[PDB]
Design an enzyme around this catalytic site. Sequence first.
Site, PDB file in Angstrom:
ATOM      1  N   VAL A   1      89.982  40.906  28.889  1.00  0.00           N
ATOM      2  CA  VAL A   1      89.093  39.967  28.182  1.00  0.00           C
ATOM      3  C   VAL A   1      89.783  39.432  26.917  1.00  0.00           C
ATOM      4  O   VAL A   1      90.516  40.189  26.199  1.00  0.00           O
ATOM      5  CB  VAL A   1      87.755  40.608  27.859  1.00  0.00           C
ATOM      6  CG1 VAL A   1      86.880  39.662  27.064  1.00  0.00           C
ATOM      7  CG2 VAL A   1      87.034  41.133  29.073  1.00  0.00           C
TER       8      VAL A   1
ATOM      9  N   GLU B   1      97.410  34.011  17.217  1.00  0.00           N
ATOM     10  CA  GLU B   1      96.892  32.840  16.461  1.00  0.00           C
ATOM     11  C   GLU B   1      95.956  32.065  17.400  1.00  0.00           C
ATOM     12  O   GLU B   1      96.384  31.731  18.523  1.00  0.00           O
ATOM     13  CB  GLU B   1      98.046  31.961  15.978  1.00  0.00           C
ATOM     14  CG  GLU B   1      97.700  30.484  15.924  1.00  0.00           C
ATOM     15  CD  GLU B   1      98.896  29.550  15.982  1.00  0.00           C
ATOM     16  OE1 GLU B   1      98.736  28.365  15.628  1.00  0.00           O
ATOM     17  OE2 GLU B   1      99.985  30.011  16.378  1.00  0.00           O
TER      18      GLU B   1
ATOM     19  N   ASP C   1     104.830  33.378  33.760  1.00  0.00           N
ATOM     20  CA  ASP C   1     103.500  32.989  34.259  1.00  0.00           C
ATOM     21  C   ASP C   1     102.916  31.846  33.451  1.00  0.00           C
ATOM     22  O   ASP C   1     101.721  31.885  33.097  1.00  0.00           O
ATOM     23  CB  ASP C   1     102.548  34.175  34.242  1.00  0.00           C
ATOM     24  CG  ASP C   1     101.237  33.904  34.933  1.00  0.00           C
ATOM     25  OD1 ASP C   1     101.211  33.147  35.912  1.00  0.00           O
ATOM     26  OD2 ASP C   1     100.222  34.513  34.499  1.00  0.00           O
TER      27      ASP C   1
END
Length: 282
Positions: A17, A75, A121
């Site tokens: 998450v 960030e 990725d």
Amino acid sequence: MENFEKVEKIGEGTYGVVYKARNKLTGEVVALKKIRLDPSTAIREISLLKELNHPNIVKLLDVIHTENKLYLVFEFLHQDLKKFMDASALTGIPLPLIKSYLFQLLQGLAFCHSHRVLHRDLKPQNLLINTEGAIKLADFGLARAFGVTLWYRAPEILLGCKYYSTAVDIWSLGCIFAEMVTRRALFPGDSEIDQLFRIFRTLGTPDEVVWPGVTSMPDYKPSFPKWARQDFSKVVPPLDEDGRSLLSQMLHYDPNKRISAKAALAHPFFQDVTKPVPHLRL
Ligand SMILES: Nc1nc(-c2cccc(CC(=O)O)c2)c2nc[nH]c2n1
């Protein structure tokens, strides 16, 4: 959370998450990524990524290992490229802005690659934009440390090669370039084999002539259908000859033949690059 005053789920990321969180001591809004575990090596390896700073890489602000949980602090940016492309689907992203974004992404890759860090990725969800015209790549170096959208995967990965090179990132960025231009994913495969065969149907089935060594790839099968290759003029219209030439160099089958990020920055397609202001609806 004991160190974050407020925390809101952004969504389900590639490692767990991702939250928008407000640091309790400083008030700073960050992207806080909780790594879904059940990895001493990964902590030291990722902690090294805290040192990297470039305008086109999302800063890794901290690595937090507490209560036997692992969090990465990055960030925060207000939009990803996926959402921006969706918001721009009726008009298209203007060409000068596509060109600016591609140029910036290549600067971020060139930086990361020169420091011996790959992404592996890249995808629109990890390309983040701000109101000032910047775009930044998030999550560079995590895949090596830690060991699903297939649409941006290089063919050598899909063919079962377990040795990754800088070229995998150039492939993914080429796919993203094409998607910005056409407003559709280039190779939207639903499985590894559909992904592979979508590539083959556009670029032709690879062979030993264009890709020496391909037929000894772990997952290569001599029974793959043999498709002829299509022209990039059909694939990414109305991209001009310079853009099509660059894209073709980013999408060579043989990773060793693909253009490097550094060389790509010198391509004639960037003979008039600028840094426009995007219209972001936040
Ligand atoms: N607002 C925002 N969101 C994400 C984010 C949120 C969800 C998913 C991902 C990528 C993935 O998991 O593939 C990235 C950021 N990553 C660094 N800074 C960020 N800022």
